[PDB]
Design an enzyme around this catalytic site. Structure first.
Site, PDB file in Angstrom:
ATOM      1  N   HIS A  19       0.719  -1.241  -0.013  1.00 34.21           N
ATOM      2  CA  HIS A  19      -0.069   0.061   0.044  1.00 34.21           C
ATOM      3  C   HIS A  19       0.857   1.410   0.092  1.00 34.21           C
ATOM      4  O   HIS A  19       0.605   2.436  -0.745  1.00 34.21           O
ATOM      5  CB  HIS A  19      -0.891   0.008   1.192  1.00 34.21           C
ATOM      6  CG  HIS A  19      -1.984  -1.035   1.317  1.00 34.21           C
ATOM      7  ND1 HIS A  19      -2.062  -1.870   2.452  1.00 34.21           N
ATOM      8  CD2 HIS A  19      -3.012  -1.352   0.515  1.00 34.21           C
ATOM      9  CE1 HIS A  19      -3.199  -2.566   2.330  1.00 34.21           C
ATOM     10  NE2 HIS A  19      -3.756  -2.312   1.145  1.00 34.21           N
ATOM     11  N   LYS A  43     -18.273  -4.765   8.781  1.00 29.61           N
ATOM     12  CA  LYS A  43     -17.439  -5.603   8.190  1.00 29.61           C
ATOM     13  C   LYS A  43     -16.689  -6.137   9.422  1.00 29.61           C
ATOM     14  O   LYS A  43     -16.415  -7.336   9.532  1.00 29.61           O
ATOM     15  CB  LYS A  43     -16.407  -4.567   7.487  1.00 29.61           C
ATOM     16  CG  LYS A  43     -16.807  -4.045   6.180  1.00 29.61           C
ATOM     17  CD  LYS A  43     -15.805  -3.359   5.370  1.00 29.61           C
ATOM     18  CE  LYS A  43     -16.395  -2.036   4.693  1.00 29.61           C
ATOM     19  NZ  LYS A  43     -16.574  -2.232   3.284  1.00 29.61           N
ATOM     20  N   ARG A  92      -2.286  -6.324  -8.833  1.00 32.65           N
ATOM     21  CA  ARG A  92      -1.096  -7.348  -8.592  1.00 32.65           C
ATOM     22  C   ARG A  92      -1.349  -8.574  -9.360  1.00 32.65           C
ATOM     23  O   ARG A  92      -2.057  -8.269 -10.385  1.00 32.65           O
ATOM     24  CB  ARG A  92      -1.294  -7.584  -6.976  1.00 32.65           C
ATOM     25  CG  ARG A  92      -1.563  -6.286  -6.183  1.00 32.65           C
ATOM     26  CD  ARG A  92      -1.291  -6.418  -4.746  1.00 32.65           C
ATOM     27  NE  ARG A  92      -2.335  -7.236  -4.123  1.00 32.65           N
ATOM     28  CZ  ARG A  92      -2.092  -7.909  -3.150  1.00 32.65           C
ATOM     29  NH1 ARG A  92      -1.064  -8.190  -2.673  1.00 32.65           N
ATOM     30  NH2 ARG A  92      -3.548  -8.637  -2.429  1.00 32.65           N
ATOM     31  N   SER A 130      -2.797  -8.663   3.289  1.00 32.60           N
ATOM     32  CA  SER A 130      -3.205  -8.434   4.592  1.00 32.60           C
ATOM     33  C   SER A 130      -3.781  -9.617   5.615  1.00 32.60           C
ATOM     34  O   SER A 130      -3.359  -9.605   6.579  1.00 32.60           O
ATOM     35  CB  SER A 130      -4.038  -7.296   4.702  1.00 32.60           C
ATOM     36  OG  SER A 130      -3.771  -6.261   3.943  1.00 32.60           O
TER      37      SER A 130
HETATM   38  C1  LIG Z   1     -13.575   0.001   0.096  1.00 34.62           C
HETATM   39  C2  LIG Z   1     -13.332  -1.170  -1.239  1.00 34.62           C
HETATM   40  C3  LIG Z   1     -12.986  -0.317  -2.336  1.00 34.62           C
HETATM   41  C4  LIG Z   1     -12.473  -2.039  -1.035  1.00 34.62           C
HETATM   42  O1  LIG Z   1     -12.533  -3.238  -1.535  1.00 34.62           O
HETATM   43  P1  LIG Z   1     -11.099  -4.343  -1.673  1.00 34.62           P
HETATM   44  O2  LIG Z   1     -10.568  -4.256  -3.094  1.00 34.62           O
HETATM   45  O3  LIG Z   1     -11.203  -5.536  -1.306  1.00 34.62           O
HETATM   46  O4  LIG Z   1     -10.074  -3.360  -1.078  1.00 34.62           O
HETATM   47  P2  LIG Z   1     -10.262  -3.496   0.647  1.00 34.62           P
HETATM   48  O5  LIG Z   1      -9.855  -2.302   1.199  1.00 34.62           O
HETATM   49  O6  LIG Z   1     -11.700  -4.255   0.935  1.00 34.62           O
HETATM   50  O7  LIG Z   1      -9.355  -4.801   1.014  1.00 34.62           O
HETATM   51  C5  LIG Z   1      -9.703  -5.990   1.110  1.00 34.62           C
HETATM   52  C6  LIG Z   1      -8.929  -7.018   0.759  1.00 34.62           C
HETATM   53  O8  LIG Z   1      -8.033  -6.534  -0.459  1.00 34.62           O
HETATM   54  C7  LIG Z   1      -6.636  -7.073  -0.305  1.00 34.62           C
HETATM   55  N1  LIG Z   1      -5.693  -6.099  -0.886  1.00 34.62           N
HETATM   56  C8  LIG Z   1      -5.812  -5.220  -1.825  1.00 34.62           C
HETATM   57  N2  LIG Z   1      -4.786  -4.548  -2.066  1.00 34.62           N
HETATM   58  C9  LIG Z   1      -3.905  -5.253  -1.213  1.00 34.62           C
HETATM   59  C10 LIG Z   1      -2.381  -5.077  -1.014  1.00 34.62           C
HETATM   60  N3  LIG Z   1      -1.655  -4.002  -1.741  1.00 34.62           N
HETATM   61  N4  LIG Z   1      -1.693  -5.777  -0.132  1.00 34.62           N
HETATM   62  C11 LIG Z   1      -2.258  -6.491   0.676  1.00 34.62           C
HETATM   63  N5  LIG Z   1      -3.570  -6.748   0.422  1.00 34.62           N
HETATM   64  C12 LIG Z   1      -4.613  -6.259  -0.468  1.00 34.62           C
HETATM   65  C13 LIG Z   1      -6.569  -7.642   0.966  1.00 34.62           C
HETATM   66  O9  LIG Z   1      -6.583  -8.909   0.929  1.00 34.62           O
HETATM   67  C14 LIG Z   1      -7.713  -7.140   1.972  1.00 34.62           C
HETATM   68  O10 LIG Z   1      -8.150  -8.098   2.894  1.00 34.62           O
HETATM   69  P3  LIG Z   1      -8.610  -7.542   4.338  1.00 34.62           P
HETATM   70  O11 LIG Z   1     -10.216  -7.518   4.018  1.00 34.62           O
HETATM   71  O12 LIG Z   1      -8.394  -8.381   5.274  1.00 34.62           O
HETATM   72  O13 LIG Z   1      -7.980  -6.094   4.332  1.00 34.62           O
HETATM   73  C15 LIG Z   1     -14.911  -1.570  -1.465  1.00 34.62           C
HETATM   74  O14 LIG Z   1     -15.303  -2.405  -0.647  1.00 34.62           O
HETATM   75  C16 LIG Z   1     -15.871  -0.132  -1.507  1.00 34.62           C
HETATM   76  O15 LIG Z   1     -15.460   0.352  -2.440  1.00 34.62           O
HETATM   77  N6  LIG Z   1     -16.815  -0.185  -0.681  1.00 34.62           N
HETATM   78  C17 LIG Z   1     -17.663   1.016  -0.602  1.00 34.62           C
HETATM   79  C18 LIG Z   1     -19.004   0.873  -0.454  1.00 34.62           C
HETATM   80  C19 LIG Z   1     -19.489   0.563  -1.992  1.00 34.62           C
HETATM   81  O16 LIG Z   1     -19.655   1.373  -2.750  1.00 34.62           O
HETATM   82  N7  LIG Z   1     -20.060  -0.718  -2.361  1.00 34.62           N
HETATM   83  C20 LIG Z   1     -20.540  -1.055  -3.608  1.00 34.62           C
HETATM   84  C21 LIG Z   1     -19.722  -0.620  -4.617  1.00 34.62           C
HETATM   85  S1  LIG Z   1     -20.437  -1.209  -6.210  1.00 34.62           S
END
Ligand SMILES: CC(C)(COP(=O)(O)OP(=O)(O)OC[C@H]1O[C@@H](n2cnc3c(N)ncnc32)[C@H](O)[C@@H]1OP(=O)(O)O)[C@@H](O)C(=O)NCCC(=O)NCCS
Length: 163
Positions: A19, A43, A92, A130
């Site tokens: 990140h 969550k 990634r 993570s």
């Molecule tokens: C916030 C949001 C963008 C996050 O989704 P995401 O791509 O999974 O990114 P998150 O922050 O949820 O990360 C979740 C997982 O991604 C992974 N991840 C993504 N990038 C990573 C990185 N660089 N390194 C490690 N893990 C990573 C992890 O495994 C993480 O697991 P965790 O849940 O233990 O943290 C998404 O849930 C969102 O936009 N929510 C807003 C509400 C909304 O609009 N919902 C409907 C949209 S259609």
């Protein structure tokens, strides 16, 4: 000649070297970058919003064009409120790629102005999750390699109580 502002959402629970890389990359190419921490009411994140934002601040405060803010509700609305040019996502080898397309395209349907712009992180960070980091910490293993020092200490401090 307009200013660029990108929103980088996630749960950052907790923030990882991956990140950090990404934000560093993004700070170099966009005028402003907002590290956007999704609260996660429904969550249940390990770290509190304050702890997540603190840890992010510690690993990225030196970048001067990087903001840190928690948010809930709809990313599309956060996008609008922040007057953002685009939402940044990382891509990634471990990434659910169709699952970026769903997010991106459904949000577009909610707001046709919504734009998404992926960056890829330095290959050493292509495999860290993570979920696995949190699990290693939980089982008293070394996470020094995968997260900033501050986060490593956070993990001890979490052991040291219970919440
Ligand atoms: C916030 C949001 C963008 C996050 O989704 P995401 O791509 O999974 O990114 P998150 O922050 O949820 O990360 C979740 C997982 O991604 C992974 N991840 C993504 N990038 C990573 C990185 N660089 N390194 C490690 N893990 C990573 C992890 O495994 C993480 O697991 P965790 O849940 O233990 O943290 C998404 O849930 C969102 O936009 N929510 C807003 C509400 C909304 O609009 N919902 C409907 C949209 S259609």
């Amino acid at each position: 000649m307009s200013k660029t502002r990108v929103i980088y959402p996630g749960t950052f629970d907790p923030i990882t070297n991956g990140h950090v890389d990404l934000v560093t990359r993004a700070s170099r190419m966009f005028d402003e970058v907002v590290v956007a921490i999704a609260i996660g009411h429904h969550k249940n994140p390990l770290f509190s919003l304050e702890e997540r934002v603190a840890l992010a601040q510690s690993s990225l405060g030196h970048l001067s064009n990087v903001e840190f803010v928690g948010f809930d509700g709809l990313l599309v609305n956060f996008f609008k409120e922040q007057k953002a040019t685009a939402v940044l996502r990382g891509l990634r080898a471990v990434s659910d790629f169709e699952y970026e397309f769903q997010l991106a395209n459904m949000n577009r349907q909610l707001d046709p102005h919504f734009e998404a712009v992926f960056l890829t992180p330095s290959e050493q960070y292509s495999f860290i999750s993570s979920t696995l980091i949190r699990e290693i910490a939980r089982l008293k293993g070394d996470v020094t390699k995968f997260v900033p020092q501050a986060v490593v200490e956070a993990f001890e401090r979490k052991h040291q109580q219970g919440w």
